[PDB]
């Protein structure tokens, strides 16, 4: 039984675009039906890393449940997670991806964070996250209280360190910012570690899955 994504792109649906809780939560599917021009995807402009690969890996799925990998009310006691954006406006009001959280400063501080997750779900777990690129150093200080920031995601197959590139861009959907999106499959048994002192667009929900 095929999976309709409506007017959404795989990016939007999987990120949790606000115009994307839309839909009939399904547990399994064979192939995926998506418009060539999907209108609601990366509501906040930016590059989705290894997008074509992800669309293949998701093309065929036998089990699929969403679950809250890093719970909003206990994971981030030293960081602000309330921020929302008019770039992700649902029904008129500002909002954000349901599967991510925009961490920003709290009490004038953005403490070094490191939070980890061990896969205990006996299925591959798809983990998504973003990194924010502000267009100037004024924004950078305002959101994260640090001029030089890093994000580091590390598992047994994944190891990358992002530094945000800060400079002028063209406006897409009235935004100068970019968020770059990233994803890794987390094998049952592996542990993924996020470390950052700024710019992390943190995962909130993730997905357990299988492919036949």
């Amino acid at each position, epitope marked *: 039984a095929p999976l309709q994504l409506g007017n959404c792109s795989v990016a939007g649906w999987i990120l949790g675009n606000p115009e994307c809780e839309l839909l009939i939560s399904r547990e399994s599917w064979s192939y995926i039906v998506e418009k060539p021009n999907p209108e609601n995807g990366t509501c906040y402009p930016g590059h989705f890393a290894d997008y074509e690969e992800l669309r293949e890996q998701l093309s065929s799925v036998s089990s699929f449940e969403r679950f809250e990998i890093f719970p909003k009310e206990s994971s981030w006691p030293n960081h602000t997670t309330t921020g929302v954006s008019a770039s992700c406006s649902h029904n008129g*009001e500002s909002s954000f991806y349901k599967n991510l959280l925009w961490l920003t400063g709290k009490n004038g501080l953005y403490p070094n964070l490191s939070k980890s997750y061990a896969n205990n779900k006996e299925k591959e777990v798809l983990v998504l996250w973003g990194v924010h690129h*502000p267009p100037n150093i004024g924004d950078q200080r305002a959101l994260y209280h640090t001029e030089n920031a890093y994000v580091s995601v590390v598992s047994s197959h994944y190891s990358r360190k992002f530094t945000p590139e800060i400079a002028k861009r063209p406006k897409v959907r009235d935004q*100068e910012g970019r968020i770059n999106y990233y994803w890794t499959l987390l094998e049952p048994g592996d542990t993924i570690i996020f470390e950052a002192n700024g710019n992390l667009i943190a995962p909130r929900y993730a997905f357990a899955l299988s492919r036949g």
Partner: single-chain antibody
Amino acid sequence: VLTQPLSAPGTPGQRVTISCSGSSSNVGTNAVDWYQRLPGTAPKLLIYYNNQRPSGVPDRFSGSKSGTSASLAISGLRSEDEADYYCATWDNSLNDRVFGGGTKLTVLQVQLVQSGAEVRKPGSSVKVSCKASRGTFSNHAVSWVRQAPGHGLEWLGGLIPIFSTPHYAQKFQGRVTITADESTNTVHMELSSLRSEDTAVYYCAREIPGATSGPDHFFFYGMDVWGQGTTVAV
């Protein structure tokens, strides 16, 4: 909400300091602004981003912030300093702009043009407009603020310069509509289902952005330029 001492004495020359105490949802984490309001005139931005003076402000005004409490400091205290001082910031959890109750101090370029100072019966609605010149609402948030006579400042809401999306303070959602016609460089506040509770002077103000690329609330770091006010009576 922000607690201010209700009153503050001062004598010329001497240095006086207003204080503003908040929760962490506000003040604690977000930038704090201070406004001064003399009578008849419009409120004036003294300090934004905790400690920044906008141009045209004497070295006499200084601002600081520590933990959950900010402070406005006047050092050479003229007589023309006698006015109401307000204290402002964003509050997460409320997700709104939020004003101090006010302190009365007692002793011993872009332009916005609001229009339509007018009268109305209860139950009706009003549409105030605000036109820009030698400047724009293109890369700036605009705020609407009212003051009921013998009351403090009160944020009705704002316009974020991304898809022209409105943002309505809790107390007002459902009654307020804010819109823009950018061809005419004007912003419009329409308040409906009026009542005497709403008779006030209404103001339109442009916000200094703390960040243009972040969550909405970083657009509102300080109202530096104000309309003239529009009086509305019910």
